[PDB]
Amino acid sequence: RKTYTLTDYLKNTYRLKLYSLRWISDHEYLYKQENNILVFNAEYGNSSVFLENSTFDEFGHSINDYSISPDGQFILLEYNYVKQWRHSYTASYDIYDLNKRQLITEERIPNNTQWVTWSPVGHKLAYVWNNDIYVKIEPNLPSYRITWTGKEDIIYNGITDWVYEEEVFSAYSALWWSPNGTFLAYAQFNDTEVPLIEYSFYSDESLQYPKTVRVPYPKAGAVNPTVKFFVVNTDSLSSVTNATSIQITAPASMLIGDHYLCDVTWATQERISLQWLRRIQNYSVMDICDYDESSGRWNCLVARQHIEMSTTGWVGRFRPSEPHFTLDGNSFYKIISNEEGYRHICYFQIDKKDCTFITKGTWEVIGIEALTSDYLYYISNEYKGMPGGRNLYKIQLSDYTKVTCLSCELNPERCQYYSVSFSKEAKYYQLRCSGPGLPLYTLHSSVNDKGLRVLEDNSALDKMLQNVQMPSKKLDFIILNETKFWYQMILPPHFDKSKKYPLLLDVYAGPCSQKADTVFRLNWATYLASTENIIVASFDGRGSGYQGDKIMHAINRRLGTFEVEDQIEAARQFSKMGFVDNKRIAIWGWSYGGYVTSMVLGSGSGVFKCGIAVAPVSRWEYYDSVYTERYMGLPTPEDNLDHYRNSTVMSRAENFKQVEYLLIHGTADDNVHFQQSAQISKALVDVGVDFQAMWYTDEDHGIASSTAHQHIYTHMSHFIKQCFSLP
Amino acid sequence: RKTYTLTDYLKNTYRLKLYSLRWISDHEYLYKQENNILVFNAEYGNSSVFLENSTFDEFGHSINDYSISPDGQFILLEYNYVKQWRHSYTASYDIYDLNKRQLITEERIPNNTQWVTWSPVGHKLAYVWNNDIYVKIEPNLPSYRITWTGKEDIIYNGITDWVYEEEVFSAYSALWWSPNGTFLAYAQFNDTEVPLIEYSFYSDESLQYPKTVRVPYPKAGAVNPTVKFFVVNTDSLSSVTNATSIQITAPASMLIGDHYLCDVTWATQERISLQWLRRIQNYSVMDICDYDESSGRWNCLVARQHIEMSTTGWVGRFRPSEPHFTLDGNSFYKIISNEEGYRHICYFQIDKKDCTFITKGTWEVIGIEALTSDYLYYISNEYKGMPGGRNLYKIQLSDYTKVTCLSCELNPERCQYYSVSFSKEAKYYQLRCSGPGLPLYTLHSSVNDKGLRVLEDNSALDKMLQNVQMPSKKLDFIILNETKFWYQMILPPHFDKSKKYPLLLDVYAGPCSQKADTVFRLNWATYLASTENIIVASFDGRGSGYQGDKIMHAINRRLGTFEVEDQIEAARQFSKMGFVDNKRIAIWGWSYGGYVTSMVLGSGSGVFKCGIAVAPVSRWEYYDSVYTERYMGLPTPEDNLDHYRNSTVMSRAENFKQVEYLLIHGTADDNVHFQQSAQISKALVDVGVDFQAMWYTDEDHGIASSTAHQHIYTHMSHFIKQCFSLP
Amino acid sequence: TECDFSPMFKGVAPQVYNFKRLVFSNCNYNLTKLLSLFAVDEFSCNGISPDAIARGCYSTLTVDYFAYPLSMKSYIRPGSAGNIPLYNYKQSFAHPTCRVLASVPPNVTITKPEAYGYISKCSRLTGDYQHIETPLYINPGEYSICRDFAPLGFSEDGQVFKRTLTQFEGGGLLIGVGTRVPMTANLEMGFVISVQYGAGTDSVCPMLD
């Protein structure tokens, strides 16, 4: 039959169909069928029309995105959306009064706000404009100003700077409503002393003089931004009185030196929890503070602090886990590594330092999704001992002995990677299977775990794919020393066990990452396997996780040493199956994958014929402070400067002489600056090694613009074709 | 035998030996041998030791260059040379008392001086430091400050800004001593409203943050720098007296709008001639002023002014010609266009407007080299009617019908390209032959044109090259309509006139320029012809010189229309001979040649398979003001904006579907900014056309770094080999 | 002789943590002046009454005065567990006390400092990984060990000062945090008055014939 061509990827002929719902109650959810918003009752499946299909909601501007108030009375509509960072963007907002007929035209939200959020209940609004926080109690009332210190690129009130957005919070928003909606907590970031990275932006062709973009960006060993934390009582706002912000001071053990705020979670209506982290990622602290009605301040008693310390490595996977509090708020559950180096769920009382583990075994609990008074639901990879699987289990609050799986037998062949979205109060939950078979979205009732109905099965996609030569996926393990390590291979269809197939290695190999799992993807590797008949392999090495801390922390303070050797070893063991051609082997990777690809090519093994690095990291002093210092500490002569200088790509530049290298980097990359690729090019030039290069002007780290996406992928495909001599 | 390989080029195995001398008197010159400096008598040839191998002269710093005082009493040593622009650079200077043994220790030239200059007589010193002019009457006395308005990037005293240096003066110096040295004239440039171009510099690997280089650079249609002109009596400065600078005002016809000054020529002491040229380059004014010592003012009547205007196009080749004043200073000869558009010598009295021509013919006078009391010596291309040949002639001042060629008959076969350097008072002159044979340096006496001795013959180089397969060079012309245009071909050794050779078109095709000549060169084309058996062709069409204003100005206000069409037509005409393969024609060029290559590739002719552009020009609105506005006028809607918009490369981007394009650009290019190639790449991506690119970090327009030069040429060689399927 | 109130009227008003103390023995005070130099907002007395300091003779008076915003009137209140008693000023309930929050009139010559301030956290952090917090709480009538980090006041609200403690001090990095409260139109002050009996053979009296 016909195969999956490159154009099929590029033109998205095979569209993955999703079923995204938003619970607005304990038994009803919204869904944008067509572009109108239907409301669905879970128990019967009957549907009605919440918002009618028409240009009436905005009229005159293309509608980008919308948000429904919790009470369903108002709709917030945004247009003129302009993305700036990964999560940073600006747009204009209007409020449509869904209650009777019309838009609200008085006291409209400004034409350049950076972020807008509803209260959890009611219809309050909080937005950020010119780095200042403004609050509207009612959509048709004038706004109340909360902050006055906002200043472009210097002070951020309620909004994150670049580094916190990208590496710490992984989200743009920096304000959190109270459960009842009375308190609004926010963070303020000061970047006065942060050095600015400057790069050229060319913009539209008609621009005569290129402009210089300056971004506050703390590199490894630079002055880090400072962070402060405040809360405001929204119920006390008055027209002729300045807003009052009560400050919450960081714990004493934390603010000795540079420190970061990890995340903030509301416990009860007047109880809050904050996670702080030392700059040297160890000794994380959870603080719990209660509102004092007599004293507007927040008293954080010493006995309610909880400490997290690591020895073999750093704290947490990427960030200390957020606690899930009980209804009363006097106890909670947290994911924490055990004495055997495995992550499990510990039950904490707010006044006790000792945690009682409720799960145990040679596996890791991935996440707590929902908490009731009698059952706790979680995602874990215990099933079949497969690190690349995810399943839903529930445990009784009373007796921890009883553990029941809710997804193990639902569809074993088509599902090993489950995710779940619970309704309010957890009467119902939607299950999403993203495992080996086509993704499947279903709805179930928690009361008696009965399957209710199939929401989305992608049946049309299955019928279309029945005429297409799809590849196969194999997941297995190889034993190195006294430990097994997992790997996956995308095999071309009609895979012959006797023929010699070429092997292309997709490598991210980043710490805590995982490239070998059961997730179904249709991407570039799929086209390679289907049309070009290339076996695409990925391997989990010694910083890869969901597997333990014995494996996870093996690369602590020695980045780029054990992972590279592990990739080399994986290739070597892959060599002796009859399906791998030793002469033609290549390693490609993106970002950190590019760094690993470059270091592997500079290893001198001679196994790999060629390699592609897309925006590779070249010298860890060039990267941002938080990410690098998580694994490497500070680059000072007394602490770790020796390993910083030794682990550069440039120092291995001469080893590139035997291999063919392809380097790609966008000029407007705000994440991995062009400087890294420029330095690699300089080293290769003055060592006299030939190579290929490709720059994409005005493109960011993701190279997500449509045309740039097409061009980069066809260029990489052409390069792979010539290197493997596929034509 | 051995062939001329890439290594032979890039390691410079075959080095050209030259003979550089500097006249200091009527009959003696210095010559730098190995480490010592010798003084040579012209009439007898006997030599003496001027300076010995004083390796201990700085005992710790290497002497880069040296400067001889006119009287020979002092020697100037320069070191710590740091190139800044094409001609601009900074260095440290020391003054050595040559008379017995000693260096000067008290009052020495500063570390960061931008320019240093001897007086024509005596041993006066004039230098520029921190954009300020200082004068030393003696080496061992403190300097007298002459200027006080010096301020970097704003006000330039005594030295040129970027655009004046690059396009107008072709030098950093902007100060001129009187012939007796009694007066010092200089210019002051104001660049307050000149826009700044910013580009990123990455520097050495250890630098964590890239720096931003900012240059005052007037793009097409921007505010040009203003110029003021001053004269100072060098004999009058005292320690207790501020410097007095008499300003010279521009002529009344010039003040109406923006204007340029072309050059300055001392017409005897007391009398000076200055050439101004309006922003629109179609009119120019030479003003002569006499100093009135009895008043101290410059009372220089309008009646002694002269004007030059053009109708077809601009004035001059790049600027109005240099005036050569008689001994008395009452008459002078200039190179100006005649009635039919050829440049010849016209004789001018300071008191009348009409000029009398003394030379005529269908040829061009390239330069006037010397004026005696009875004969005028000039270099012209009249011999053999070849615009690519240069010969020296003399004519009687009384009866100018007597013409004597000084180089026609001395060596017709080996030499057709001569340059000459006369001694003081022009008693002896050195002739330098640059092609088509090996360079030949000879010395002759003016009295009876008797050859004295051969200074350099390069005989050993010829004998050692005799066993190496050198390419051949053919020079000829073709006719299009009633007009002839010249071309040259580098042909592979043992060139077969019948068998099929591939063709590479080397193009610059810039206005007024000439690439078809008789000069012998060892360059990339030599290696390509020697090893890859590739014919390298060059062609001089409109509007190249030096063949009269008919061809010169035919391309006025029409850049990229007649030149590109003529290049395409030339390629088509090249195809029709039996020894060139039409399916295997490539094209490449540099700078303006890059613009030509981009335009021809975007034409859709289909005769070119693939092509390389290094630092190509893409849009004239991006380039500097002077160069473009000379040929295009101002980019304003009423004047020529439509033609500015109709001649951008990006508009032709889609037409690159059929051709393979390699784009190379240095990111630190200050002349052709990286913006230009970045926009080229952005357009090519936005039309989704595949191409190759490769950037060179921190390299300038010339890419003169040894390793960078090696890398760029080997990369281009690999690319052309691949495109042509040679290996 | 008359009681010397002059030190209270010279220089900037002291902060709550850097309060100042005046001990009166063998002197007479003019009540006419004290009635006019201040406008009392609150007179709060424990085991004592104002209508008895103003008409009786005592062996000793002790006045602790500081600058205190009226807005935080009850934070200083006795039996509160707020920052103020923990790190700034704890007045013994057993000591007879008449805590007075008042306001200085415009023409009275008491220099207004910059914005008010109080010590948010004063802690003796110690431990191998610096894990132990071990907060330090001032005993009644005792200045905070965090008094000297910035005696004048706090430059910006939420300020941190870290000073290593030697073994005599107890070891570990002493840590302090300070909070800043905007200054009002009129300087507002707090006073703690204590009367001591049988502490000598001379008395403090109101000026009377």
Ligand SMILES: *[C@@H]1O[C@H](CO)[C@@H](O[C@@H]2O[C@H](CO)[C@@H](O[C@@H]3O[C@H](CO)[C@@H](O)[C@H](O)[C@@H]3O)[C@H](O)[C@H]2NC(C)=O)[C@H](O)[C@H]1NC(C)=O
């Ligand atoms: C010759 O003329 C120049 C004209 O620039 C004189 O230079 C300028 O002289 C004035 C008056 O002395 C200087 O102003 C002074 O500036 C200093 C700054 O610290 C200030 O403290 C003084 O009160 C006064 O305002 C001015 O700066 C100076 N400009 C430069 C570029 O030096 C020069 O003094 C005259 N005489 C000589 C010594 O030939």
Ligand SMILES: *[C@@H]1O[C@H](CO)[C@@H](O[C@@H]2O[C@H](CO)[C@@H](O)[C@H](O)[C@H]2NC(C)=O)[C@H](O)[C@H]1NC(C)=O
């Ligand atoms: C689906 O049908 C059920 C009834 O079978 C609807 O439930 C009603 O909801 C309204 C909400 O205002 C209540 O007033 C009624 O009492 C409910 N039951 C009855 C008797 O009708 C449910 O709302 C329907 N859902 C949708 C979205 O259509």
Ligand SMILES: *[C@@H]1O[C@H](CO)[C@@H](O[C@@H]2O[C@H](CO)[C@@H](O)[C@H](O)[C@H]2NC(C)=O)[C@H](O)[C@H]1NC(C)=O
């Ligand atoms: C947001 O911007 C729009 C323009 O994009 C503003 O609407 C304009 O308002 C002015 C004054 O009434 C009119 O003259 C224009 O014709 C309007 N333009 C459009 C396209 O509607 C709008 O007022 C701005 N709103 C805010 C919140 O500032």
Ligand SMILES: *[C@@H]1O[C@H](CO)[C@@H](O[C@@H]2O[C@H](CO)[C@@H](O)[C@H](O)[C@H]2NC(C)=O)[C@H](O)[C@H]1NC(C)=O
């Ligand atoms: C939401 O919850 C908060 C916290 O419980 C409520 O605020 C308190 O309400 C109680 C009862 O009215 C008062 O006794 C407390 O003094 C309030 N504390 C403060 C000042 O936060 C709030 O009223 C609840 N209601 C809302 C707004 O949803």
Ligand SMILES: *[C@@H]1O[C@H](CO)[C@@H](O[C@@H]2O[C@H](CO)[C@@H](O)[C@H](O)[C@H]2NC(C)=O)[C@H](O)[C@H]1NC(C)=O
């Ligand atoms: C952001 O940081 C700057 C620098 O820390 C703060 O400005 C300084 O504040 C200190 C007091 O802590 C003064 O001594 C300095 O004179 C101030 N100037 C600078 C630039 O150093 C600024 O207050 C901070 N802003 C916020 C809102 O936190």
Ligand SMILES: *[C@@H]1O[C@H](CO)[C@@H](O[C@@H]2O[C@H](CO)[C@@H](O)[C@H](O)[C@H]2NC(C)=O)[C@H](O)[C@H]1NC(C)=O
């Ligand atoms: C709330 O406080 C802010 C502090 O910035 C006040 O804004 C300033 O007010 C003063 C006058 O008191 C002006 O001179 C400044 O120009 C204002 N600055 C800004 C950033 O606007 C604001 O007026 C206060 N609002 C009140 C009194 O409710």
Ligand SMILES: *[C@@H]1O[C@H](CO)[C@@H](O[C@@H]2O[C@H](CO)[C@@H](O)[C@H](O)[C@H]2NC(C)=O)[C@H](O)[C@H]1NC(C)=O
């Ligand atoms: C947590 O990180 C700290 C640094 O903030 C570690 O401190 C080390 O302390 C010992 C004391 O003997 C020193 O020898 C080390 O040099 C310190 N290391 C660094 C990175 O400075 C502390 O041990 C860490 N805790 C762990 C890993 O359990």
Ligand SMILES: *[C@@H]1O[C@H](CO)[C@@H](O[C@@H]2O[C@H](CO)[C@@H](O)[C@H](O)[C@H]2NC(C)=O)[C@H](O)[C@H]1NC(C)=O
């Ligand atoms: C070359 O030789 C001539 C002599 O043949 C030199 O000229 C003489 O120079 C000396 C001084 O050194 C005078 O005293 C003589 O009167 C000169 N004689 C003549 C004939 O001019 C000349 O200097 C020598 N030149 C060099 C550079 O060696």
Ligand SMILES: *[C@@H]1O[C@H](CO)[C@@H](O[C@@H]2O[C@H](CO)[C@@H](O)[C@H](O)[C@H]2NC(C)=O)[C@H](O)[C@H]1NC(C)=O
């Ligand atoms: C300057 O140095 C050069 C060497 O670089 C000397 O030249 C050599 O001189 C000796 C003795 O005459 C000859 O045997 C050599 O053949 C010369 N060249 C070489 C290859 O070394 C020169 O003599 C020195 N001159 C002075 C003035 O000291």
Ligand SMILES: *[C@@H]1O[C@H](CO)[C@@H](O[C@@H]2O[C@H](CO)[C@@H](O)[C@H](O)[C@H]2NC(C)=O)[C@H](O)[C@H]1NC(C)=O
């Ligand atoms: C140019 O710079 C050099 C330094 O690079 C100066 O030389 C120094 O002079 C000082 C003072 O006499 C000495 O202490 C240093 O040891 C010298 N260093 C070197 C490398 O020689 C020099 O004086 C400067 N010259 C001028 C003209 O300013």
Ligand SMILES: *[C@@H]1O[C@H](CO)[C@@H](O[C@@H]2O[C@H](CO)[C@@H](O)[C@H](O)[C@H]2NC(C)=O)[C@H](O)[C@H]1NC(C)=O
């Ligand atoms: C260069 O030109 C600028 C004009 O931009 C001159 O600056 C002006 O100076 C005069 C006299 O001081 C002022 O009245 C103008 O307001 C200034 N204009 C601006 C916008 O700066 C500058 O002085 C000139 N420099 C020289 C010495 O030629």
Ligand SMILES: *[C@@H]1O[C@H](CO)[C@@H](O[C@@H]2O[C@H](CO)[C@@H](O)[C@H](O)[C@H]2NC(C)=O)[C@H](O)[C@H]1NC(C)=O
């Ligand atoms: C020099 O150039 C200018 C600008 O091109 C000429 O001025 C224009 O000439 C054209 C043709 O004669 C007229 O149509 C315009 O009205 C003129 N004015 C403008 C727009 O500048 C000028 O005539 C030229 N002079 C010479 C000596 O040829």
Ligand SMILES: *[C@@H]1O[C@H](CO)[C@@H](O)[C@H](O)[C@H]1NC(C)=O
């Ligand atoms: C909304 O659009 C759908 C088609 O996408 C159409 O069937 C429906 O009738 C529309 N509703 C309206 C116009 O009310």
